[PDB]
Design a binder for this molecule. Structure first.
Ligand code: YCT
Length: 515
């Protein structure tokens, strides 16, 4: 869970009085010692509500290690002859695509503007190195009677898909179209690479499209890192000089499967976490009374738009202060604000919000390529006329309770809860809230000037998806990915603007009742 990691970071920063606390920063190297160790332990106990001690800090002196310490066997490499293993999370992504026919909605884009036009032959060679390094990028998925079956292509058998595209109209719409193009994972590797050039394009835009089964947003940094390494090596006519991965995704999947156990085992983590979610999601609403422009259609088209709400740096910093002062993450502030927004729009006091949680505590997978996101239903209650500060306490309690049962795959949770189904409605929740941080130090890739560019998606996965997105070099914005079937664009622009308004009011005076 990344949430533990940012809480430990916020605690390190406050105690050491430093603004440079990263997930890999050693507490004692940061300037800490035994005296300040007591203050870190005391603050983490009051915030996290778990019995943490000096021992945990000593053995795990970095936020990533300490967070992982609070979250199960370590991932072990299974040897070269081991067959591929699809994780439960991958199986869930395969199910939603087959059962709900989401076409291209789950494709993950990663677009980088490059001041130089890249060499297509070197890029293709580098993509082959990237695919050879990360087995998940050359793992096909084929249907069967039992379900999906992984098929690991050998590096020499994985035909990479690398092509240059000349941009006619605006580049942003081309990026969205290329992203929406569906994969056939039975015959194509889950990676498409496109270099967009044109008279309007200065240099090129490098677009990586991954099928979600093979990458999450947390994979952007290792993707660009490794692709840059391979491109530079291939431009010099050599193979990239890198060590093997400490673990492949199949290693992570096998370890997760063995630890989860069988749902029929009363002592297995799977059944115990499923039992929690069965109780926690009792009497859940089928859906929230949101203000749509059109009724929910019989079948979902999964068309969508993207409405941005720019946040002034002073608002981003005020939101950070509000999170730090109440001992919550920025995500919890955003999640609380979204709950207030839907509440003020008439959704009631019982607000289920879907949210991704990253299962990247193990150091063998903490910085690797793959899909490590589970989906949790964060059920926030707004009854009793709470203030926003009160809500931040409720949200923290709901989230921490949820983060302790984050391994039960969301599809098993849907099976256990058994809500009424509808192919045009995502079950258990239809609004997702997430916090995302884009990679830093990706400005000099491929020996050029580079910058990430956001892709304006033409697809949507739920009714509403709110994302607080930090760019990695200072700024932040809210991205609302809305279902076009339900909302017009201007309704979504208004929705994302009213969320910023709620955030502005919460920072100004968190003691206002949310009603
Ligand atoms: P954190 O890891 O930074 O902890 C700080 C210290 C330095 C470990 C702190 O615990 C500490 O001061 N340890 C020192 C303990 C120590 O050295 N005691 C000396 C023993 O003195 C006596 O007890 C005395 N009876 C010695 C006899 C042999 C005469």
């Amino acid at each position: 869970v990344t949430a533990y990691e940012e809480i430990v970071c916020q605690v390190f920063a406050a105690v050491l009085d430093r603004s440079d606390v990263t997930a890999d920063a050693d507490f004692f190297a940061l300037g800490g010692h035994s005296l300040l160790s007591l203050r870190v332990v005391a603050r983490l106990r009051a915030l996290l509500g778990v019995d943490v001690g000096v021992r945990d800090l000593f053995e795990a002196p970095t936020p990533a290690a300490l967070a992982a310490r609070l979250t199960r066997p370590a991932v072990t490499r299974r040897g070269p002859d081991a067959p591929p293993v699809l994780s439960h999370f991958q199986r869930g992504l395969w199910l939603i695509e087959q059962v709900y026919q989401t076409r291209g909605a789950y494709n993950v884009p990663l677009a980088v503007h490059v001041s130089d036009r890249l060499d297509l032959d070197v890029l293709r060679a580098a993509v082959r190195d990237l695919v050879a390094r990360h087995e998940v990028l050359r793992t096909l998925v084929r249907s069967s009677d039992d379900g999906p079956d992984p098929v690991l292509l050998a590096p020499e058998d994985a035909a990479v898909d690398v092509a240059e595209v000349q941009a006619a109209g605006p580049v942003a719409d081309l990026l969205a179209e290329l992203t929406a193009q569906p994969f056939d994972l039975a015959t194509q590797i889950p990676l498409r690479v496109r270099m967009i050039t044109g008279e309007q394009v200065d240099g090129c835009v490098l677009l990586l499209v991954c099928h979600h089964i093979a990458a999450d947003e947390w994979s952007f940094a290792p993707l660009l890192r490794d692709l840059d390494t391979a491109y530079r090596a291939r431009a010099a006519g050599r193979a990239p000089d890198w060590e093997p991965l400490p673990a492949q995704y199949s290693d992570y999947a096998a370890t997760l499967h063995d630890w989860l156990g069988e749902a029929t085992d009363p002592a297995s983590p799977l059944r115990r976490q499923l039992d929690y979610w069965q109780h926690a999601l009792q009497d859940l609403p089928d859906e929230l009374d949101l203000p749509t422009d059109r009724p929910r259609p019989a079948t979902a088209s999964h068309r969508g738009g993207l409405a941005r709400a720019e946040l002034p740096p002073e608002l981003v910093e005020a939101v950070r202060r509000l999170a730090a002062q109440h001992g919550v993450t920025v995500f919890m502030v955003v999640q609380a604000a979204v709950a207030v927004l839907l509440h003020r729009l008439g959704a009631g006091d019982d607000i289920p919000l879907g949210s991704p949680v990253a299962d990247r505590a193990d150091e063998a997978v903490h910085d690797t390529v793959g899909f490590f996101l589970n989906t949790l239903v964060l059920r926030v209650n707004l009854s009793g006329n709470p203030t926003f500060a009160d809500l931040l306490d409720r949200v923290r309690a709901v989230d921490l309770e949820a983060f302790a049962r984050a391994d039960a795959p969301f599809d098993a949770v849907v099976d256990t809860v058994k809500p009424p189904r509808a192919v045009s409605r995502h079950p258990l929740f239809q609004t997702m809230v997430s916090y995302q941080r884009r990679p830093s130090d990706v400005d000099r890739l491929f020996g050029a000037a580079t910058r990430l560019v956001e892709v304006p998606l033409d697809t949507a996965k739920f009714d509403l998806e709110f994302a607080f997105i930090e760019d990695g070099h200072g700024g932040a914005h809210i991205a609302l990915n809305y279902a076009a079937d339900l909302f017009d664009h201007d309704s979504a622009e208004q929705l994302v603007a009213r969320l910023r308004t709620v955030l502005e009011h919460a920072c100004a005076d968190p003691c206002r009742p949310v009603a």
